[PDB]
Amino acid sequence: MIKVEIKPSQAQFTTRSGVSRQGKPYSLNEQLCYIDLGNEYPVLVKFTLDEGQPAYAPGLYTVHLSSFKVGQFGSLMIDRLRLVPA
Amino acid sequence: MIKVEIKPSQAQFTTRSGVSRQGKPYSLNEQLCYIDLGNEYPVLVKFTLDEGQPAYAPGLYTVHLSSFKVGQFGSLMIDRLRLVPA
Numbered sequence: 001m002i003k004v005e006i007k008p009s010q011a012q013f014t015t016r017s018g019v020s021r022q023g024k025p026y027s028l029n030e031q032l033c034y035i036d037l038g039n040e041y042p043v044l045v046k047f048t049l050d051e052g053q054p055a056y057a058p059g060l061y062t063v064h065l066s067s068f069k070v071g072q073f074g075s076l077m078i079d080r081l082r083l084v085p086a
Numbered sequence: 087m088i089k090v091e092i093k094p095s096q097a098q099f100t101t102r103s104g105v106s107r108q109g110k111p112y113s114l115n116e117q118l119c120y121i122d123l124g125n126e127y128p129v130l131v132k133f134t135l136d137e138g139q140p141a142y143a144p145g146l147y148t149v150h151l152s153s154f155k156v157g158q159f160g161s162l163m164i165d166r167l168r169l170v171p172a
Binding site: 046069070075077 | 087088121122123124129130131132133134151152154155156159160161162163164167
């Protein structure tokens with residue numbers, strides 16, 4: 001299991017916006033977290049939330065299986081970091 | 087935890103080869119596995135082994151933390167699927 005932490009200072013998201021190739025508006029909500037990758041300190045990671053999802057609250061989380069997909073070259077990839085409470 | 091299985095038929099690797107942009111030879115060893123991504127059946131996934139590593143033997147495995155890195159856009163990515171026995 002991957003240990004993810006949302007710190008008190010990371011309790012909010014920011015939103016970026018634009019327009020797709022054929023004219024549709026979009027909005028993407030991004031939040032920050034710390035992930036323990038086995039180095040001397042956890043590292044800062046950004047991720048995009050799914051549509052209609054609030055920012056994750058401060059606390060400890062692990063990564064859900066739905067974060068992963070098989071890519072176009074037949075290998076595993078992360079689609080979007082989706083979290084569940086520890 | 088991600089559940090990975092090496093079937094009896096997947097006990098071997100194949101090797102691809104070539105030459106880098108400035109002339110150095112390389113070899114990459116690739117092996118297949120099945121990963122349970124929560125769909126009705128496990129899916130077929132290819133991955134490259136690290137240098138000097140034998141093919142994983144048939145059996146059940148999970149993914150090691152060293153499989154992950156922060157990418158150039160600040161988000162989590164899989165570098166190479168590295169496995170450890172379940």
